[PDB]
Design a protein around this nucleic acid. Structure first.
Ligand code: RTP
Ligand code: MG
Length: 476
RNA sequence: CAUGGGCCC
RNA sequence: GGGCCC
């Protein structure tokens, strides 16, 4: 998105952390090319000659405007994927009850309790237990006063820039490539779930290549659904965007909002409203009130759905803008916002799309960048989706998500203070799929020190998840 | 003891 | 309440 150009303000929004993340006993064994991000332009490690606050805003290279015939081409594609979308999800997209928006239907996790509240509830000391009864699902004064307000469209706000205390490859750290999180006022996040909460539920619970979304899925059982499907095709590309989130041009955004969330598909007129408030934003990083047109607010409600709908309409628009007769069945695709796998028989050309894609402000590039350009052949066992490769499992003939040891090792070098035992239980079931030998190497560090799930119990868990009746087949 | 949105104990 | 992927 284009910055008008940031201002001064007298109020000053603290963030600049020091990492809650810390080395582990694994840390010294694995010596990973991975550290906590920078949470301070003062932080030593950091290359010298680096103002951390520069880069955070170097993802705003402008805001591609779109010809009038591209806006029509894009409109069609969005109404088309929208036709598909509501064909599979139905048209029951009535507003959600403040009770659900807080509580959550069957497929919409509740809103989280102890979570930051956005503005200005932190310019005025208050957490989200002070305007909502999380586990009674209950508004209070201003939430309900603003509920009333956005109902009128006479509501307006600002986004609280943050920094992702997270691990990152060492180099990205030194570039000061910290990931931003733009936190929305919690009232907003709530109205949004009312406006489009039943949509997102249905999305979550019909994920699959049919709707091109993997949001809602379980990389751990769903990998089988997905692997067999994608191995039915002669060509499978692993595409990488870049700044995906921030380069959603203003026109692309306003069109999909208009095309996906109309009232003719069951929504309430104000679902376009809450959504379009997301185009031109005000990001308050500290005393800098940075004002931006374009992009998405990474972490603005439904952020992953939106970005997924958008990726889907982009591909189809890039194919539609290069050849004729391209329908949704021309290909197949699954994304999770940024991430995307695509497949096709038609021997399609993806280095011929880069430009058509650059007409929306987006820069695709191959995943295997140590070639040069998009090639044919690649099956679904050369790609990555969500940081997991597709491998088939010896013992079962089933597909399974596998992360590079170097990643797994990264995750296992750093924990928040006294989380190490819990984290490990969690990472145990990721590392299952790396086999018995590596699972073991990967955990030597913590022996006689922490509890380590047996490789065997994690396997039979998995086997029962992927298709329980094969659990029951390792029997008769 | 970051936002979203998912899912895992 | 924790971990991950996005
Ligand atoms: N926590 C959040 O609010 C959140 N997390 C993931 N997302 C959606 O998923 C995308 C992940 O962006 P990345 O960190 O991969 O970077 P990028 O902007 O896509 O590209 P690159 O790393 O190539 O510069 C984002 O761009 C965003 O659309 N939002
Ligand atoms: Mg990828």
């Amino acid at each position: 998105g284009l910055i008008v150009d940031t201002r001064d303000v007298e109020e000053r929004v603290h963030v600049m952390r020091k990492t809650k993340l810390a080395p582990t006993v694994a840390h010294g064994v694995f010596n990973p090319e991975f550290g906590p991000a920078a949470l301070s332009n003062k932080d030593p490690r950091l290359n010298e000659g680096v103002v951390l606050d520069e880069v955070i805003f170097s993802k705003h290279k402008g805001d591609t405007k779109m010809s009038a015939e591209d806006k029509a081409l894009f409109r069609r594609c969005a109404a088309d994927y929208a036709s598909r979308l509501h064909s599979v999800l139905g048209t029951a997209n009535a507003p959600l009850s403040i009770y659900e928006a807080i509580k959550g239907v069957d497929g919409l996790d509740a809103m989280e309790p102890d979570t930051a509240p956005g503005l200005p509830w932190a310019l005025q000391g208050k957490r989200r237990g002070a305007l909502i009864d999380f586990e009674n699902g209950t508004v209070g004064p201003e939430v309900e006063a603003a509920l009333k307000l956005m109902e009128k469209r006479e509501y307006k706000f600002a986004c609280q820039t943050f920094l992702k205390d997270e691990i990152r490859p060492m180099e990205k750290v030194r570039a000061g490539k910290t990931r931003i999180v733009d936190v929305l006022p919690v009232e907003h996040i709530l109205y949004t779930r009312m406006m489009i909460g039943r949509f997102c539920a249905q999305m979550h619970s019909n994920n699959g290549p049919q709707i091109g979304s993997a949001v809602g899925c379980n990389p751990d059982v769903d990998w089988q659904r997905f692997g067999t499907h994608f191995a039915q095709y002669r060509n499978v590309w692993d595409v990488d965007y870049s700044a995906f989130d921030a380069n959603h041009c203003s026109d692309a955004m306003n069109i999909m909002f208009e095309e996906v969330f109309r009232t003719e598909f069951g929504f309430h007129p104000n679902a376009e409203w809450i959504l379009k408030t997301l185009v031109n934003t005000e990001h308050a990083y500290e005393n800098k009130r940075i004002t931006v047109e374009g992009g998405m607010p990474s972490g603005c409600s439904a952020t992953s759905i939106i970005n997924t709908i958008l990726n889907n309409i982009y591909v189809l628009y890039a194919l539609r803008r290069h050849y004729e007769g391209v329908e949704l069945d021309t290909y197949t695709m699954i994304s999770y916002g940024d991430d995307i796998v695509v497949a096709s028989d038609y021997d399609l050309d993806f280095e011929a799309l880069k430009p058509h894609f650059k007409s929306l402000g987006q820069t695709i590039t191959p995943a295997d960048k140590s070639d040069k350009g998009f090639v044919l052949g690649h099956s679904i066992t050369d790609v990555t989706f969500l940081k997991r490769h597709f491998h088939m499992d010896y013992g079962t003939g089933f597909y399974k998500p596998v992360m590079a040891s170097k990643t797994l090792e990264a995750i296992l070098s750093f924990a928040r203070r006294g989380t190490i035992q819990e984290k490990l239980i969690s990472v145990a079931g990721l590392a299952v799929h790396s086999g018995p030998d590596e699972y073991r190497r990967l955990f030597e560090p913590f022996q006689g020190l922490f509890e380590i799930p047996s490789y065997r119990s994690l396997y039979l868990r998995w086997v029962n998840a992927v298709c329980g009746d094969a659990a029951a087949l390792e029997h008769h």
